[PDB]
């Protein structure tokens, strides 16, 4: 005992759609614990390297901007009308990390074969301790719930391949990534290490000025140039890298002659940027199109 009243939880999460943005949904602690526990089971039963098929919609960082998450579903179609892949960074920086991750977990549980969540670098206790999620849990619930989230985040998948052609991850490529089997061998639960394959997948960035690999300004992981992308795509017979992790003005931005695209789905990020958010739709023929969300 007991079951999880998923439909009531989702109904309450969706209730505030159209209300003055910022209006909270305060689930019970056990409801949220239920969401973490049941989704954690689902994450572990599915591969850490997801293998997905189009059509699906792909979204980048949300960062607790819950009403922008709802807008994405509004324009993209609420599950299960459309399949979704999110590229991580659900929490921190925004005002409503809790509503955000809870709706995502809820949909993961309700539609486990049509709804998918990758791990971002903010789905990591050492990071979201600092940038808001801990403070939000502590304020609205307790630190024990925050540790329950950590335990759940530690089981998220870290990459996805869509129809053997699009490689998806939060950050980018790794100098340790030589085979896809190296990703599949990563055991869960796990924290995000300070270095290595898992770290790079959640932390690395493309860089125009770097030929091969370079030092990353974040002080973690690496930057990789257009050449690194071309070699990677050719080696694994892929057409595109789809990642997130960086705020871009129009919500999406191409790199290396459209061989890589960055998606960022949190419009006016932190209230400091004037960026749009974007969502990429991939149809059954792997035609990719962008919906852009201008900030409210």
């Amino acid at each position: 005992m007991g079951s999880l009243n998923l439909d009531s939880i989702i109904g309450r999460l969706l209730e505030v759609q159209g209300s003055r943005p910022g209006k909270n949904v305060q689930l019970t602690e056990n409801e949220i614990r239920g969401l973490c526990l049941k989704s954690r089971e689902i994450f572990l039963s599915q591969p850490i390297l997801l293998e997905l098929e189009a059509p699906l919609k792909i979204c980048g960082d949300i960062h607790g901007q819950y009403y922008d998450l709802l807008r994405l579903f509004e324009y993209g179609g609420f599950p299960p009308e459309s399949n979704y892949l999110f590229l991580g960074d659900y929490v921190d920086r925004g005002k409503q990390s809790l509503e955000t991750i809870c709706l995502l977990l809820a949909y993961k549980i309700k539609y486990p074969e049509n709804f998918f969540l990758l791990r971002g670098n903010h789905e990591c206790a050492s990071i979201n301790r600092i940038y808001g999620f801990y403070d939000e849990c502590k304020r609205r619930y307790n630190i024990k719930l925050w540790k329950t989230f950590t335990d759940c985040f530690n089981c998220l998948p870290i990459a996805a391949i869509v129809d053997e052609k699009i490689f998806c991850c939060h950050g980018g490529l790794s100098p340790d990534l030589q085979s896809m089997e190296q990703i599949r061998r990563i055991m869960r639960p796990t924290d995000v290490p300070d270095q290595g394959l898992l770290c790079d997948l959640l932390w690395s960035d493309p860089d125009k000025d770097v030929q091969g690999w370079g030092e990353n300004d974040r002080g973690v992981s690496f930057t990789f140039g257009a050449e690194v992308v071309a070699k990677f795509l050719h080696k694994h017979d892929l057409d595109l890298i789809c990642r997130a992790h960086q705020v871009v003005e129009d919500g999406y931005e191409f790199f290396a002659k459209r061989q890589l695209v960055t998606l960022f789905s949190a419009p006016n990020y932190c209230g400091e940027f004037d960026n749009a958010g974007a969502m990429m739709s991939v149809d059954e023929t792997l035609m990719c199109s962008f919906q852009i969300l201008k900030p409210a």
């Binding site: 324009y75 052609k165 057409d239 749009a276 792997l286 199109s289 852009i292 969300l293």
Partner: peptide, 16 residues
């Protein structure tokens, strides 16, 4: 033999 292609039809969503 499917290949990734990009639509030039971009949809923008505003709030009036």
């Amino acid at each position: 033999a499917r290949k990734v292609r990009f639509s030039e039809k971009v949809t923008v969503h505003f709030l009036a």
